[PDB]
Amino acid sequence: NGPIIMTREERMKIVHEIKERILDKYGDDVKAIGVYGSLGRQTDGPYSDIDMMCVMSTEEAEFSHEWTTGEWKVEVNFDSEEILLDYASQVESDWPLTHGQFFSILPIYDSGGYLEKVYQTAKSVEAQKFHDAICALIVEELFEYAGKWRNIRVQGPTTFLPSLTVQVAMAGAMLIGLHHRICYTTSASVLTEAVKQSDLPSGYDHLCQFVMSGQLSDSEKLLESLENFWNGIQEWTERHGYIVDVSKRIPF
Amino acid sequence: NGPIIMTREERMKIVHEIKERILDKYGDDVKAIGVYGSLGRQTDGPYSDIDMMCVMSTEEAEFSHEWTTGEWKVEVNFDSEEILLDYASQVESDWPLTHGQFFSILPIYDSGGYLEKVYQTAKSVEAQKFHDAICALIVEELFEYAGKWRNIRVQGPTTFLPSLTVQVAMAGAMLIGLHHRICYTTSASVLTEAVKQSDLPSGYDHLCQFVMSGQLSDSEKLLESLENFWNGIQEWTERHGYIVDVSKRIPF
Numbered sequence: 216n217g218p219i220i221m222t223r224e225e226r227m228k229i230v231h232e233i234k235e236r237i238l239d240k241y242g243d244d245v246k247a248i249g250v251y252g253s254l255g256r257q258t259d260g261p262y263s264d265i266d267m268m269c270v271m272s273t274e275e276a277e278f279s280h281e282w283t284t285g286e287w288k289v290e291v292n293f294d295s296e297e298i299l300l301d302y303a304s305q306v307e308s309d310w311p312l313t314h315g316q317f318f319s320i321l322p323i324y325d326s327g328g329y330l331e332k333v334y335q336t337a338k339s340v341e342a343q344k345f346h347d348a349i350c351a352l353i354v355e356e357l358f359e360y361a362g363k364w365r366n367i368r369v370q371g372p373t374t375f376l377p378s379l380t381v382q383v384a385m386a387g388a389m390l391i392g393l394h395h396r397i398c399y400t401t402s403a404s405v406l407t408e409a410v411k412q413s414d415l416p417s418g419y420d421h422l423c424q425f426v427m428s429g430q431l432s433d434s435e436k437l438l439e440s441l442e443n444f445w446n447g448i449q450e451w452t453e454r455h456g457y458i459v460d461v462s463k464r465i466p467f
Numbered sequence: 468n469g470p471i472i473m474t475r476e477e478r479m480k481i482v483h484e485i486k487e488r489i490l491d492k493y494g495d496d497v498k499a500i501g502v503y504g505s506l507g508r509q510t511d512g513p514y515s516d517i518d519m520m521c522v523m524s525t526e527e528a529e530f531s532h533e534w535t536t537g538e539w540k541v542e543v544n545f546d547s548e549e550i551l552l553d554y555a556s557q558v559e560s561d562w563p564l565t566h567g568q569f570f571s572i573l574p575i576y577d578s579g580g581y582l583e584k585v586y587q588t589a590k591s592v593e594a595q596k597f598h599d600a601i602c603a604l605i606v607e608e609l610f611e612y613a614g615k616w617r618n619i620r621v622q623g624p625t626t627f628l629p630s631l632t633v634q635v636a637m638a639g640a641m642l643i644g645l646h647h648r649i650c651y652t653t654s655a656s657v658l659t660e661a662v663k664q665s666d667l668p669s670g671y672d673h674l675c676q677f678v679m680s681g682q683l684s685d686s687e688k689l690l691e692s693l694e695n696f697w698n699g700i701q702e703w704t705e706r707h708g709y710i711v712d713v714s715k716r717i718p719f
């Protein structure tokens with residue numbers, strides 16, 4: 216019957232039962248246990264799932280348990296300190312979605328500053344990694360999307376244009392979060408938070424208006440908006456120096 | 468203002484230049500080079516990008532070159548045979564999207580029949596792997612989405628509902644592709660191809676009509692149709708034997 220309504224109590228009671236089980240099973244190999252996500256921020260909604268992380272001492276440990284009782288769902292990730300610290304300092308295109316984890320840790324067990332080390336690692340990533348991630352996002356995501364909607368314009372199917380427009384708006388939101396080095400709180404707040412940031416590429420606000428209102432049925436207006444945003448991307452990347460040499464056919 | 472229009476002949480000229488560069492640069496370390504995707508499928512559209520894969524001899528090789536010339540985009544993935552074969556036989560939630568690569572390989576260089584081995588491996592994945600992927604998709608993706616839209620029903624923001632409904636339709640399309648062990652042709656064809664299939668969960672077609680028409684502005688209607696789809700998922704899993712384990716509070 217899908218997820219049920221739960222109070223914080225009820226979620227925190229579940230969390231501590233899981234914490235006790237984790238300690239019972241893995242003992243001294245457990246360096247720390249934390250809750251993250253909306254429950255970690257104390258902004259969990261009545262229907263939110265439960266996300267937990269466990270820092271292991273064990274060499275190369277990297278596994279997870281994700282399950283449901285039919286009424287709620289839990290995900291517990293287990294990583295060695297070195298693997299987690301490596302992950303916390305890697306900036307991919309979806310860093311604004313994934314790494315909010317590390318700014319929302321509610322520590323529930325910690326044998327010696329491990330969760331603070333994770334947070335410090337996440338918040339200390341050097342600027343070059345964000346610069347590289349943005350340039351890669353332009354190539355690997357937005358340029359590809361531009362080809363996809365131009366293909367739709369000339370050969371269909373327009374039945375994919377609403378979904379593609381949503382994907383472009385989300386990629387634009389990742390671009391904005393990388394530029395400002397800010398992680399979105401929840402996936403539901405991404406567009407709301409993205410359009411509140413400064414220095415957006417032109418055309419992004421208009422695109423997000425279509426996506427947030429759900430008025431995605433006028434294909435000519437969507438293609439116009441996507442092209443306008445794509446033009447804004449060209450101006451924005453040039454203004455901020457997110458440019459690589461593209462003159463050679465083969466750059467290796 | 469790329470991507471520009473190119474013919475298939477122009478793309479294959481680019482492809483063979485890149486093949487010559489790879490062989491020039493990496494030499495005897497190159498086992499095979501193939502084109503995949505729409506171009507490998509000879510169904511590339513006027514604006515399609517170029518996707519290439521390279522099997523390397525060094526056992527831990529795993530890198531890529533992805534770039535644009537301003538006018539077109541190329542992605543070349545380099546993997547050792549061992550890494551590629553393992554990846555070709557892994558079935559994740561997005562297998563219907565990602566593993567079409569392995570059924571669209573056009574070999575352009577091959578010193579040992581390596582690309583046929585990759586294809587055979589991808590084709591020979593056991594049915595249990597799809598069963599496990601379906602159960603994981605329901606728990607890890609759909610159950611989470613249900614919580615997100617139920618939270619929206621009671622506390623907003625409805626501005627995320629069009630994007631969430633798109634994500635739910637795509638997850639349903641992965642479920643259908645896993646059930647039929649079929650990879651979608653292009654990402655733009657996913658919804659059209661998923662809804663032509665047999666054995667759809669009840670409510671999925673109705674939900675996809677909103678997403679494909681782009682009529683995503685009526686929030687009550689989307690919430691009703693998501694709930695109906697969620698119910699249809701429950702009946703569909705029982706009919707097809709995809710029983711998710713809900714018996715343990717803590718399964719470790």
Ligand SMILES: [Cl-]
Pocket residue numbers: 354358461535536537
């Ligand atoms: Cl570019």
Ligand SMILES: [Cl-]
Pocket residue numbers: 362470471514515516517538539540541
């Ligand atoms: Cl291209």
Ligand SMILES: [Cl-]
Pocket residue numbers: 556591592593596
């Ligand atoms: Cl297998």
Ligand SMILES: [Mg+2]
Pocket residue numbers: 252264265266611
């Ligand atoms: Mg979650």
Ligand SMILES: [Mg+2]
Pocket residue numbers: 359516517518542
């Ligand atoms: Mg590509």
